[model samples]
Target: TDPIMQMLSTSMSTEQRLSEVDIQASIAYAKALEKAGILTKTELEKILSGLEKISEEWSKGVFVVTQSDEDIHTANERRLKELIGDIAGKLNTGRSRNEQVVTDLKLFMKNSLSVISTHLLQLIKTLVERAAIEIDVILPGYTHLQKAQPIRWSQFLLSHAVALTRDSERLGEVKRRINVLPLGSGALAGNPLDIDREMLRSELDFASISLNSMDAISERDFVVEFLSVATLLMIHLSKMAEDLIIYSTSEFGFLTLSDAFSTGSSLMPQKKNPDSLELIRSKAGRVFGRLASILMVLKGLPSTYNKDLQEDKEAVFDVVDTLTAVLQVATGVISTLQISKENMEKALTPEMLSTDLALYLVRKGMPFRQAHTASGKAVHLAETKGITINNLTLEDLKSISPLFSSDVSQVFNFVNSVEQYTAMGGTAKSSVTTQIEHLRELMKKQKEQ
Candidate 1:
């Protein structure tokens, strides 16, 4: 088996480190056997000693596999031969490569997800803390890439945090499914030996045991789910990156990205390009490609394990690596970001208060559609006079509609306009504070747990 998978390739060492979990699983299985009296204490001790050497050598960057070493399972066993000689042969008493490989993958995910979850939590905390500190910074909220209304900069930052919170929840959900043990399901049926799978599950910290061998080895839904979640997370990051890139532009200048995350142009003397954000935006497609890669690989596969599953490990590792870096970079970009209150406030125009104009009439007993039309007329009147909505006189407004009143000037005030939106999820100070408070508690609870 080792020769079959070996000679065809230049190297299979890429699987060596990921395959390290296989050594752990084998040792745990050996312990289970020792407890069951299938292997004596001395034999278990000798086997563990040899496995420890393999682990230590691998970690020290000295573990090497020759041409005879086929897959990770055989490669580790081959290394075991050199360490403990013959007692190493006793290690694979009952389990097949089918169950062993799957067990390694599950264990790998459990550990991988732990690190990923930590980074994700840190990113969320950074977003929340940064947003909380910038709570009073006001900016234009856009729709269709046009100024829609006034919103606190914190509200915008927290919106990204809210998305990450959902991503974090999704990560937990996927991890729960990845916690199942698949070590006792041998080749295609239950293990032939009377191995204590329950103990094995305990040893590996698996939340549950696999019920079917075929399903355990055949499916890679956990990997797919991870990639899918990562894709969405990257999408959220891409959007944040895009907004920052736009905001960092001289035209927008709503915020200035720190020099750490920006780069000077080689040719131009005046260019502090937001290369970090642009890369994050571009890498979103890369993460999306990984998800698509895994899904495309899973499109038409047979029941049990196949060589096709080998394609998944690298993709999964790459997505995790990409997202880990992206999340940290995003956190840096946000935490170090300087909110230009002047620039952001200056971006706010009286034209953006058009929504408040419509709603003002709505408050004055006019139907919404009528109010909408009248507001459109007000906008046209302002444009015709070549002035802002605030510059429109009461008489100018009354000429368009009788509903106009002295208080109509109040609608032109950006702060007053934003205050009117006091609904649960609106841009009002109280509403944004409610959002910030709830997310802060969640961030605390998430980190504590």
Candidate 2:
């Protein structure tokens, strides 16, 4: 608050009145010193007037030598001696620097918390936009990096959208915790300051005052909690980046990263070295490091705020700034990225569409197990013959299963096969088209909220 006096001085030129506590301390001493005939009222007024001038000048942004630790102690002692004309260290009866610095930090964290949520929400919206655009595009969905199924590309993208959605909600939780002010918490125990702390809290925009004085200033959980959430966000982004790196490679040729985002190698000129992903992957480690740093600082500390806690801000500030920037850059990268529909389409070989054929067989009275086995056999034969499951003739299919009728040919084709999955939330045209409508409605609801 003393440091903030520079701004306060802009509104009020001076603090001319002392509270009752100051007057109480002066009372007995004033009487004793006057009775002993050691000092005059004129001398008392002169010293106080000089001290008030020092304060006024200091408040106007002068860092007076009297404000330093040793100087403050020396001046405080001398002033008490001047006022009482006796030993005066007994006046050291109020507050701690621990509570004071913590209050300042709470204000700073609360302000940053609001800005953090604002940026986080924008990042979530950007992910949703990416989901909306690729909602219908089909991709070879993988498990363990092997094709396990086929899924509409949006299904995969929305997975990140959901994680980011939870992250937005988590940001709300973090901000709520930051709402509590930490002013009245004296050094370690709640000393009777006699000042109304709640009024100061309101003046500073804190939602509530800290209940436990020691806990308020000493706790570093708030910083660690933010880093925990930040690390999760970075991990989600790294997975998204990993997929982009994999799909955009010439070997997979599934999706293309926007040239604006991908960087070319300095030496190997053909290389679009996924340096963007490199940042996401490494940034997760930094967030983890900050969390660890705070926990480490808290590990051996006693009850109240230690000077070690001062390191919390620098560590936490790194991740907070890094993550916020990552969100904005990721939003740009996602918005500009191309889905490469043709390439994704090409990756969807007839073999990738085998599950479509297997389902069709199941609908035709073949048990799912039998259909799966028959489909596997047919896939094996097609591979050996250098043909797709769709390219195999009825005679070839009949060798695996007698269910191969003339009508079965149409079901094997990828187009009719894709259109057949028309259940709720299915990839069929009717279902996916309804999804697009629902997406618009959901987006509208999200914005309204």
Candidate 3:
């Protein structure tokens, strides 16, 4: 008995979370039923009053759930019966839980996505604002977790912001697909009550009515698309979290997390752990797991609604909660974290400027292939002499290449090295400033939408 109830009736609890949207859909359906001559004027008013009362009970947290209540639809119907008696039975005229559940889910996702987008935009805004303030901070850029070149710190911050901006754009597309109406598709066939679906669409703010009744009730493609987009979003957050974690380490010492977002160890008094970022990093897998499991559930199911379709609600609800919390935590961690300009700058080495040496030879009318080899020889000579590449004298460089000149000394300067990258999307101050302004314009456009 316990196993049967747990397996079959778990949706009752999950569907309870959709209570508000469920009631909203029912209110619209009631009007549609009245328009189709299925309900008299007095019955329509009574049903409306009953649905309104149920909505209020939910809002005030006074609504009760009974073991016999199968889902939100039945639960609300049961409550309506108690309040307004048998008039509630007429409300289900031609509707089926198959169509009702999907309609409720679409409404829930459409609204939930708007809130998630707001949180995502806030995180992007934080990163962009920090980039504007800390544009001058320069640090070593890494390729394979090894320092490769000098870069403006703002470049690093804006890189993650740009990735998240794409995620925001993708979220808008997914929301559009989720805006289609799926009501009036009854029990894997179609509504036969002459319900005015157009009126329902307008009342519920759906962009368009579904074309095929069976497909409308059965398809979870919109749900899959949402998880797909959310999976990518979580991946972006996880990457940013990983970068922050590495930067906060003692070895890197480029960033320090705020105590508010950090934790202390039980035994190690000196330990201040980045628990916030680590959790953000780990939760990416949680979202990914949801996505994978939902795909598996849908993969083997036949056409139209099945018991398998019920599995979709929990996956979606979990991902929504995951993204909401993870986004806020990521925003807090980023907004409160402190960066050490001295430490970041100190990590830059003359060896990181080897590419600049090659470019110097290229500027002196030498071919890149020859310039590359000469730069490599310069590095080898520096290693042989037990000094940095910058320590190599003009004569030492000229011995490797006759093109070497007194001005070649400028190639060793870290500021000069980074400033040389003035092209678009580069790590130079001008390029970084351009990036910040572009992101601001993008955010403005997003807000207008």
User: Best candidate, TM-score-wise?
Assistant: 3
Q: Evaluate model 3: give its TM-score.
A: 0.96
C-alpha lDDT of all candidate models, in order: 0.84, 0.64, 0.91
Model 3 per-residue lDDT tens digits across residues 90-170: 999999988888999999999999999999999999999999999889898889999888998899999999999999999
Q: Which is the leading candidate under lDDT?
A: 3
Q: What is the lDDT of candidate 2?
A: 0.64
TM-score winner, 2 or 3: 3
Model 2 worst lDDT window (10 residues): 11-20
RMSD of each: 2.4, 10.1, 1.6
Which parts of model 2 have CA positions greater than 4 angstroms off?
1-95, 265-270, 383-386, 402-407, 410-449
Candidate 1: tens digits of C-alpha lDDT, residues 161-214: 999999988988898999999988888877878788999999988889988888
Candidate 3, superposed: residue stretches over 4 Å from native: 1-6, 265-270
lDDT (Cα) of model 1 = 0.84
Residue 147 in model 3: shift from native, Å? 1.4
Candidates 1 and 2 compared by TM-score, better number:
1
**lDDT of model 2, residue 448:** 42
